[PDB]
């Protein structure tokens, strides 16, 4: 599969980089999209190469989607193409993994009504106002949506998400 | 398996944390050992809890060993118990994974003569002086010793190491 990651400066470093490696380890291809090609820098200073700008990504081009956290989702959610990609992939049933603030992008995509998941508790009320049930668990699997809260959940997040990537 | 990680302050954050989560994802138990219980802080500022002091670890207690990099190997290698643990486990044929500066601990354990592996190139000459053949590869498998160089190698390093945990 081809797995797309949406991020930007201020990403939570472990939440982007550890899944990039975990998913490539399985033999999938991984791609990072952001506002522009170049590099993006995480909260803790690691640099990651951006393969594609959002405008270059087709809403049907990739097979699965990963939404890391940090401060990046708060700006990614403003890009209309990023949220269009997210909406189309989520509504099509493609595997979508989110952690921490990642669901801000799903909120802006308008896809959470009647869904169930988790996030950092600091945006619980926003997830609930987007129409989802929020629960406090290390990982939630709601159909195609696999969600976790914070970096300490990474092992459980990827344990469940990699099952959807087969 | 119970998998032991030896580290200390100044560890390369991704080289400790991503494998901790990868191995826990498999359902294995993971343990971080260092000079003392408490927290250790990486070069990039992530904090990891130390489960055991080196003195609490039996040289035969764990099933596999991980030696992350950063500045931590340079101090771990001074601790007699850490070196004794590493020597016993490595000589017993138990899976040992190293990355970056990790092999400084193996050098000090006296176990590298006639072995083959990689590391950060900045310690190639010391690996050679310890009696090993040094090669520049994203991952090397020499019997029980799985070695890599830098964080960019994580996916390949773990792909090969997890095979030995099966």
d(CA A150, CA A139) in angstroms, rounded, equals 10
Q: What residues are paired with A47 via a beta bridge?
A: A41
- DSSP-derived 3-state class of residue A72: helix
Q: Is B5 exposed, middle or buried (0-12, 13-18, 19+ CB in 10 A)?
A: buried
Q: What residues are paired with A70 via a beta bridge?
A: A11
Query: Of B91, B67, B75, whose CA–CA distance to B144 is shortest?
Result: B91
Phi, psi for B43 (deg, rounded to 5)? -55, -35
Method used to solve the structure: X-ray
DSSP tag of A71: S
DSSP tag of B36: S
In this structure, what is the dihedral angle of CA atoms B128, B132, B135, B141, given to the nearest 10 degrees?
-160
Point out the residue among B45, B151, B154 whose CB comes nearest to the CB of A44. Answer: B45
d(CA B141, CA B97) in angstroms, rounded, equals 9
Q: What residues are paired with B30 via a beta bridge?
A: B3
Phi, psi for B151 (deg, rounded to 5)? -55, -30
Angle between helices A13-25 and B13-25 (to 10 degrees): 60
Catalytic residue at B28?
A: no
Cα dihedral sign for A69, A74, A75, A76? Answer: positive
Phi, psi for B26 (deg, rounded to 5)? -75, -10
Chain B interface, Cβ < 8 Å to A: 13-14, 17-18, 20-22, 24-25, 44-46, 151, 154-156, 158-159
- DSSP-derived 3-state class of residue A20: helix
**A72 vs A6, A76, A100, CA distance in Å?**
9, 6, 11
d(CA A131, CA A140) in angstroms, rounded, equals 16
Answer whether B78's CB lies under 8 Å from B46's CB: no
d(CA B108, CA B86) in angstroms, rounded, equals 9
Partners of A159 on chain B (C-beta within 8 Å) are 25
Q: Is B113 exposed, middle or buried (0-12, 13-18, 19+ CB in 10 A)?
A: exposed
Task: For chain A, list the domains and their CATH numbers.
Answer: 1-166 (3.40.50.880)
The residues of A carrying an active-site annotation are 101
Q: What residues are paired with B148 via a beta bridge?
A: B99
Query: Of A28, A6, A22, whose CA–CA distance to A166 is shortest?
Result: A28
Answer whether B6's CB lies under 8 Å from B67's CB: yes
Minimum Cα–Cα distance from A45: chain B residue = B44
d(CA B69, CA B154) in angstroms, rounded, equals 12
Chain A interface, Cβ < 8 Å to B: 13-14, 17-18, 20-22, 24-25, 44-46, 151, 154-156, 158-159, 162
DSSP tag of B130: T
d(CA B124, CA B86) in angstroms, rounded, equals 20
Q: Is A159 exposed, middle or buried (0-12, 13-18, 19+ CB in 10 A)?
A: buried
Mutate to test the interface with A, among B22, B148, B160 (most CBs of A within 10 A): B22
State the number of CA atoms in the 13 A half-sphere of B108 facing the CB: 20
In this structure, what is the dihedral angle of CA atoms A64, A69, A74, A76, given to the nearest 10 degrees?
-30
DSSP tag of A113: T
d(CA B19, CA B25) in angstroms, rounded, equals 9
d(CA B74, CA A119) in angstroms, rounded, equals 38
Partners of A46 on chain B (C-beta within 8 Å) are 14, 44, 151
Point out the residue among B25, B44, B155 whose CB comes nearest to the CB of A24. Answer: B155
- DSSP-derived 3-state class of residue A1: coil
Minimum Cα–Cα distance from B22: chain A residue = A155
Q: What residues are paired with B29 via a beta bridge?
A: B2
d(CA B124, CA B34) in angstroms, rounded, equals 25
**A148 vs A101, A102, B4, B123, CA distance in Å?**
10, 9, 26, 39
Query: Of B21, B151, B164, whose CA–CA distance to A158 is shortest?
Result: B21
d(CA A64, CA A30) in angstroms, rounded, equals 10
- What is the number of residues in chain B? 166
Answer whether A68's CB lies under 8 Å from A16's CB: yes
Partners of B45 on chain A (C-beta within 8 Å) are 44-45
Point out the residue among B14, B21, B154 whose CB comes nearest to the CB of A155. Answer: B21
**A20 vs A6, A116, A139, A141, CA distance in Å?**
11, 25, 18, 20
Minimum Cα–Cα distance from A158: chain B residue = B25
d(CA A28, CA B159) in angstroms, rounded, equals 12
d(CA A77, CA A82) in angstroms, rounded, equals 7
- What is the number of residues in chain A? 166
Point out the residue among A14, A20, A25 whose CB comes nearest to the CB of B159. Answer: A25
Query: Of A151, A162, A144, whose CA–CA distance to A25 is shortest?
Result: A162
End-to-end CA gap in chain B = 9
């Amino acid at each position: 599969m081809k797995v797309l990651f949406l991020s930007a400066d201020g990403f939570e470093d472990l939440e982007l980089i550890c899944p990039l490696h975990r998913i490539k380890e399985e033999g999938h291809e991984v791609y990072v999209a952001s506002f522009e090609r170049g590099k993006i820098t995480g909260k803790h200073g690691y640099s990651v190469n951006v393969d594609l700008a959002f405008e270059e990504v087709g809403p049907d081009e990739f097979d699965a989607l990963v939404l890391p956290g940090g401060r990046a989702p708060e700006i990614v959610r403003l890009n209309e193409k990023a949220i269009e990609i997210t909406r189309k992939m989520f509504e099509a049933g493609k595997p979508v993994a989110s952690i921490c603030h990642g669901p801000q992008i799903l909120i802006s995509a308008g896809v959470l009504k009647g869904r169930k998941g988790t996030s950092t508790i600091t945006i619980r009320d926003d997830v609930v106002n987007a129409g989802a049930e929020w629960v406090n668990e290390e990982v939630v699997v709601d159909g195609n949506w696999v969600s976790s809260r914070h970096p300490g959940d990474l092992y459980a997040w990827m344990r469940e998400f990699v099952k959807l990537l087969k």
